[PDB]
């Protein structure tokens, strides 16, 4: 005689503590604990009294000899709004968060703080355990084929099913609606769900989605080899210091030149390139001027602090252009020029763009994500098939000798026990969302224009393919590009927003987001205390109404570009 949504019902969910039936028979509950309410903190909204359940699914040994399991953590509030929530991952996953239901966007509130039931997974591997010194550290899960499948799609499927079964037993009813919010790798997960598991979630937010993540290391090898002629000095292995190709002052000059060409193309000079399409048609660093001195951005002779050398201009132009093979066939996409490639807040230069292709300037070693960091490591072990484990010191050189006629094929290939390609299990490129749309599914995409991890133009290209394949796609899927914003957060733009509130309104009331309110997390980039702007559904952009404070969303409306 155990009442629903109670401490007794919570503790009954543990193995050997009752009658709970899990969808996957290999589910092990390690924790089923009643949690008191937690007060608000400086960085988190208050958490209601809830049941916390944590465990793992399909504990096994991989073909690499390492243990694998799909961890989950679920929190079911005693006072429940009838909604189910899953948060996405980041990086290459491998960690189990507090699972309070992050909504991204730099937000204080969690889904659990709004009385959702919330769940998270580690994706099928554990960074504390699946750490192989001969397979590039925590990307070493790529040595096991099933761990790849779990990372690609299976972990989120198993955890969604397990969460909904516990919700049904704990509350005595299924969730009215289910929601998923993820950014980066979590954005790829959201797109994967809409394509592969259309009925798992009714509302999906997919920010900066790496829906072509196996191509990232291809872009990384390209940007690495493109910036190398501008590098100064060598690291300990004799590899050119890609981080020395551009100083922070150099990048700020590039950004200021982008603003000189593109800032006013939306009708208002405000440090924000709202008209990104017009900017791409207008800006060329080989021709653009330095608006501070009126002279050309590219140096005429020797390098000064007010110009970029012709080698630098050639290098960044090639990097932004995107990778091509010998036939000239594009292998990923190009990248948009934007002011968030740099930015200055007080005396602090923005690192949020250069960390991906360049790395920190004040280092005698390469530390860019795409040169020697996690992204380059992940491609070699997780996305190349068969995997290419190596010592950590060899990664930068491996990117320098990357062959664009041979190596890109490895993301489409199968080998031995690796029976799916990395584009098979990790890719989420399908525009067949009819099952998702026709059951009432709604999807909000967002992407920062100054994202150096994944190209915002590549998300836009996906959205255009979606609208062509599905007439009237704006009725269930809308894309919100964020000028100036880096990867998932940061940069001179309005990078903070509450995506959960309009997602619920769209799914449950049919109210499509004609704009989404946003604010800047670092308004010092513009020298103000605060800046609020509307995000606009693609292809619309923000247009100043002609009067009022330029830092207040009320004085802007969404419209077609000028
Ligand atoms: Ca502007």
Name 487's bridge partners: none
- Distance (Å) from CA 530 to ligand 1 centroid: 16
Q: Which residues 6+ apart lie within 8 Å of 281 measured at CB?
A: none
Residue 140's nearest CA partner among 370, 423, 390, 334 is 390
Residue 32's nearest CA partner among 49, 56, 9 is 9
Annotated ligand binding at 6? The verdict is no
Rg (CA), the chain: 24
Catalytic sites, residue numbers:
184, 451, 487
Q: Rounded to whole angstroms, how far apart are CA atoms 551 and 97?
A: 35
Which approach determined this entry? Answer: X-ray
Q: How many CA atoms lie within 13 A of 340 on its CB side?
A: 33
How is 171-187 classified by DSSP, letter by letter? HSS--SEEEEEEETHHH
- Distance (Å) from CA 264 to ligand 1 centroid: 5
Burial class (CB in 10 A: 0-12, 13-18, 19+), 38: middle
Annotated ligand binding at 234? The verdict is no
Q: How far is CA 299 from CA 247, 254, 309, in A?
A: 15, 12, 5
Q: Rounded to whole angstroms, how far apart are CA atoms 363 and 179?
A: 42
- Distance (Å) from CA 544 to ligand 1 centroid: 9
- Residue whose entry in the numeric block shows the structure tokens 């006072």: 79
- Give the 3-state secondary structure of residue 15: coil
Enter the tokens of residue 265: 């193309």
Q: Which residues 6+ apart lie within 8 Å of 145 measured at CB?
A: 63, 417, 418, 419, 420
Q: How far is CA 467 from CA 259, 275, 398, 455, 472, in A?
A: 31, 21, 39, 19, 7
Q: Rounded to whole angstroms, how far apart are CA atoms 36 and 543?
A: 47
Say what the resolution is, in angstroms: 1.9
- Distance (Å) from CA 283 to ligand 1 centroid: 14
Q: Rounded to whole angstroms, how far apart are CA atoms 295 and 293?
A: 5
Burial class (CB in 10 A: 0-12, 13-18, 19+), 292: exposed
**Helix segments in 150-282, DSSP class H:** 155-171, 185-196, 216-227, 248-262, 276-282
How is 488-547 classified by DSSP, letter by letter? SS-SSS--B---HHHHHHHHHH----S-EEEE-S-GGGGTSS--EEEE-BTT-EEEE-SS
Residue 208's nearest CA partner among 509, 19, 446, 31 is 446
In the chain, where the domains are located = 1-562
- Give the 3-state secondary structure of residue 438: helix
Q: Rounded to whole angstroms, how far apart are CA atoms 113 and 233?
A: 51
- Distance (Å) from CA 266 to ligand 1 centroid: 5
Dihedral sign from CA coordinates of 126, 128, 129, 133:
positive
Q: Are 417 and 145 in contact (CB under 8 A)?
A: yes
Q: Which residues 6+ apart lie within 8 Å of 402 measured at CB?
A: 218, 221, 222, 224, 225
Annotated ligand binding at 157? The verdict is no
Q: Which residues 6+ apart lie within 8 Å of 380 measured at CB?
A: 136, 139, 217, 387, 388, 389, 390, 395, 398
Annotated ligand binding at 4? The verdict is no
Q: Which residues 6+ apart lie within 8 Å of 231 measured at CB?
A: 240, 241, 242, 244, 245
Residue 226's nearest CA partner among 351, 324, 296 is 324
Tally Cβ neighbours within 10 Å of residue 17.
Answer: 13
Annotated ligand binding at 245? The verdict is no
Q: Which residues 6+ apart lie within 8 Å of 494 measured at CB?
A: 482, 484, 485, 518, 519, 520, 531, 532, 533, 535
- CB-based burial, 151-162: b 16+ in 10 Å, e otherwise: bbbbbbbbbbbb
Enter the tokens of residue 196: 């592969």
Name 257's bridge partners: none
Q: What φ, ψ does residue 389 adopt, rounded to 5°?
A: -70, 150
């Amino acid at each position: 005689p155990v009442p629903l949504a109670s401490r007794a019902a919570c503790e009954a969910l543990k193995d050997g503590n009752g009658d709970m039936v899990w969808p996957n028979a290999a589910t092990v509950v390690e924790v089923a604990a009643w949690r008191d309410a937690a007060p608000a903190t400086a960085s988190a909204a208050a958490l209601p009294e809830h049941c916390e359940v944590s465990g793992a699914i399909a504990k096994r040994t991989g073909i690499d000899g390492y243990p694998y399991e799909i961890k989950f953590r679920l929190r079911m509030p005693a006072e429940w709004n009838g909604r189910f929530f899953m948060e996405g991952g980041s990086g290459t996953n491998g960690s189990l968060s507090a699972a309070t239901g992050s909504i991204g966007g730099g937000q204080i509130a969690s889904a659990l703080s709004r009385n959702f039931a919330t769940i998270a997974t580690d994706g099928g591997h554990d960074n504390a355990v699946n750490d192989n010194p001969d397979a590039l550290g925590t990307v070493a899960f790529g040595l096991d084929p099933q761990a790849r499948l779990d990372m690609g799609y299976n972990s989120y499927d198993q955890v969604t099913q397990a969460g909904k079964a516990a919700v049904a037993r704990f509350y005595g009813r299924a969730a009215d609606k289910s929601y998923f919010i993820g950014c980066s790798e979590g954005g790829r997960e959201g797109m994967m769900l809409s394509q592969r598991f259309p009925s798992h979630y009714d509302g999906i937010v997919a920010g900066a989605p790496g829906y072509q993540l196996p191509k990232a290391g291809i872009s990384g090898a390209w940007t690495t080899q493109s910036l190398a002629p501008a590098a100064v000095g060598l690291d300990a292995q004799g590899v050119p210091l890609i981080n020395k190709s551009f100083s922070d002052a150099d990048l700020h000059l590039l950004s200021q030149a982008i603003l000189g060409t593109c800032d006013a193309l939306d009708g208002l000079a405000d440090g924000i390139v709202d008209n990104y399409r017009a900017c791409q048609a207008a800006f060329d660093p080989a021709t653009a001027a330095n608006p501070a001195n009126g002279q050309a951005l590219q140096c005429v002779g020797a390098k000064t602090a007010d110009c970029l050398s012709p080698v630098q201009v050639t290098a960044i132009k090639r990097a932004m252009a995107g990778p091509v093979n010998s036939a000239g066939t594009p292998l990923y996409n190009r990248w948009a020029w934007d002011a968030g490639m740099s930015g200055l807040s007080g005396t602090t230069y923005n690192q949020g763009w250069r960390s991906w292709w360049l790395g920190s300037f004040n280092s005698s070693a390469n530390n860019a994500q795409r040169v020697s960091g996690f992204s380059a490591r992940s491609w070699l072990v997780d996305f190349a098939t068969p995997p290419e484990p190596m010592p950590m010191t060899q990664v930068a050189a491996r990117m320098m000798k990357f062959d664009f006629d041979i190596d890109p094929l490895k993301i489409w290939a199968t080998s031995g026990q690796f029976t799916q390609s990395s584009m098979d299990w990790h890719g989420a490129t399908s525009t067949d969302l009819a099952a998702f749309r026709d059951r009432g599914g709604k999807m909000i995409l967002y992407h920062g224009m100054s994202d150096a991890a994944f190209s915002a133009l590549d998300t836009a290209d996906y959205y255009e393919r979606l609208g062509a394949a599905m007439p009237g796609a704006a009725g269930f899927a809308r894309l919100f590009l964020v000028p100036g914003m880096n990867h998932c957060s940061g940069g001179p733009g309005t990078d903070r927003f509450d995506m959960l509130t309009p997602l619920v309104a769209w799914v449950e009331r049919g109210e499509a987001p004609d704009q989404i309110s946003a604010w800047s997390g670092t308004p010092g980039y513009f020298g103000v205390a605060a800046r609020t702007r509307p995000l606009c559904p693609y292809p619309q952009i923000a247009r100043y109404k002609g009067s009022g404070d330029i830092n207040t969303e009320a004085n802007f409306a969404c419209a077609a570009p000028p």
